[PDB]
Every structure is written in C-alpha cells, then in structure tokens.
C-alpha cells in the first residue's frame, strides 16, 4: 500500500558499501594492473 519510488535510508548503507569497494579497488587492483601493463 506504500509508494516504492520514495527515498529510503538504504541510500546511506549502499553509499558506504560502494565507498569501501571503491577504496578497496583503488588500493588493491588499479595500480597493480596498471603497473603490470
């Protein structure tokens, strides 16, 4: 009975997950593969 197009708090949850995954790749992969090539 609720509208689904409404912003929610999961915004910040997935924001944090994405930020930590961004940091993970930036420290772990890009520079390694870049220097490998």
């Amino acid at each position: 009975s609720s509208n689904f197009l409404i912003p929610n708090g999961t915004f910040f949850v997935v924001l944090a997950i994405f930020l930590v995954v961004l940091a993970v790749i930036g420290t772990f992969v890009v520079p390694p593969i870049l220097k490998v090539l």
């Binding site: 609720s2 689904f4 197009l5 409404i6 912003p7 929610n8 708090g9 999961t10 915004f11 910040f12 949850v13 997935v14 924001l15 997950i17 994405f18 930020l19 930590v20 995954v21 961004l22 993970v24 790749i25 930036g26 772990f28 992969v29 890009v30 390694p32 593969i33 870049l34 490998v36 090539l37």
Partner: protein, 220 residues
C-alpha cells in the same frame, strides 16, 4: 496479484532502511572485493596470466582508453578506478538476478530500489563537482538554463535509466510467473538471456557517461 517493489525494513538511526536490497548489495560488494583479493594474490606478471587477471586488465585498459581520450591520465587519474568499480560493482549487481529463487523472491537486484542508483549517481555528482572546483576554484553562454538543468539532469538521468532499465526486469520476472509452469520456461528463458545483455549495456553506458561528465566538469 503482482506486488510492487515493496520491502522488509528496519530502523537503525531513526530513519528506516530496507531489510533486503542491503543483503544483495552486500553480496555484490563482497564478491567484488573477493575477486579483488583473488587477483591481488594471483597477479601474474612473467608467466601466462589467469582469466580474472586478463579480465580486469581488459576492463581497465578500456576505461583507460576512454579517459585519456577524454582527459589525460596525468591530470585526473582517479577517474579510472572510480570508473571501473562503477562498471564492475554494478555488473554483478545485476548478474546475480539470473539465478532462480522465486516461489515473491528476495533475490532481486540492488538497483530495483531507487535509493541505490540515487546514492551512486549523487556520489558521482559531488565527485565531478569537486573535480570542477579542484581545477580552478558550456559552449554557449545564452543556454545557461539548459546548462542549469545540466546541473540537475545528469544526476537525475544517470540515476533514472539505471533504475528503469533494471526495474522492468524486476517486474517481468514476476509477470511470466502467472503463466502455467509447464510452458512458462521458454519466455522465461529468452528474458533471462536478454537480462545479461541489458545489465551489461546499462553498466557500460553508466560508466562511460560518468567519464564524460567528469571530462566536461574539469574543462579548462
């Protein structure tokens, strides 16, 4: 009948957060960082490379070609990692929807909720705005208002398609359920086939549009 994309939820800082769509994005993120560990450990340089190594390397050289085609890596290299995650983090975020769970299922993709794509797009928004301010502090002045909606439409557009392109799947997976199970498999099969194409294409265009918006932000 068919339910709309409702959710289970829970309150943790006064505001509510959907119970699911956190589990799925969690699975996606952990699989991404897990294959990142796999590659960092098995990164080969001298001998024949593994599948995941060549995979990531092709992705990153594609993104690299794009970025230095737009903005040289010497000036803004950080756009390259930010790009690839936007690709890969999103790619799996859709792929996991192929495996059968339904019976209503909680294994629908993370984009099926608007707030996911909202967070990603607004993050890209503030990132390229910080890029623009970092350089100095359109092509025709008199189109300021379009360039005004340029301010607003980019985070909107980038978000909305990424919702819609995915949300339709989140609906169709239910719709074919209303057909008899002994004949429903074939349209289900075709649609499952097209799911991968549309997910990949949408992630790809999202990443490329991120790159191009960064290029347009840091002009001069």
């Amino acid at each position: 009948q068919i339910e709309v994309g409702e959710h289970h939820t829970a309150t943790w800082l006064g505001m509510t957060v959907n119970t699911d769509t956190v589990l799925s994005t969690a699975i996606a993120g952990l699989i991404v960082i897990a294959l990142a560990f796999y590659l960092r450990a098995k990164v080969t340089s001298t001998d024949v490379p593994g599948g995941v190594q060549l995979f990531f390397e092709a992705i990153t050289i594609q993104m690299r070609n794009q970025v230095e085609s737009a903005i040289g890596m010497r000036i803004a290299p950080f756009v390259l990692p930010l790009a690839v995650t936007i690709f890969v983090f999103i790619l799996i975020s859709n792929w996991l929807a192929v495996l059968p769970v339904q019976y209503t299922e909680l294994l629908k993709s993370a984009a099926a909720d608007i707030n996911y794509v909202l967070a990603l797009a607004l993050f890209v928004f503030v990132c390229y705005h910080t890029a623009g301010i970092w350089r100095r502090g359109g092509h025709v002045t008199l189109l300021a208002p379009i360039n005004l909606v340029e301010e607003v439409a980019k985070p909107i557009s980038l978000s909305l398609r990424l919702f819609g392109n995915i949300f339709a799947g989140g609906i169709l997976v239910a719709l074919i359920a209303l057909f008899p199970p002994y004949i429903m498999w074939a349209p289900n099969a075709i649609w499952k086939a097209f799911d991968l194409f549309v997910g990949a294409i949408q992630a790809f265009i999202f990443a490329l549009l991120t790159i191009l918006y960064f290029s347009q932000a840091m002009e001069l």
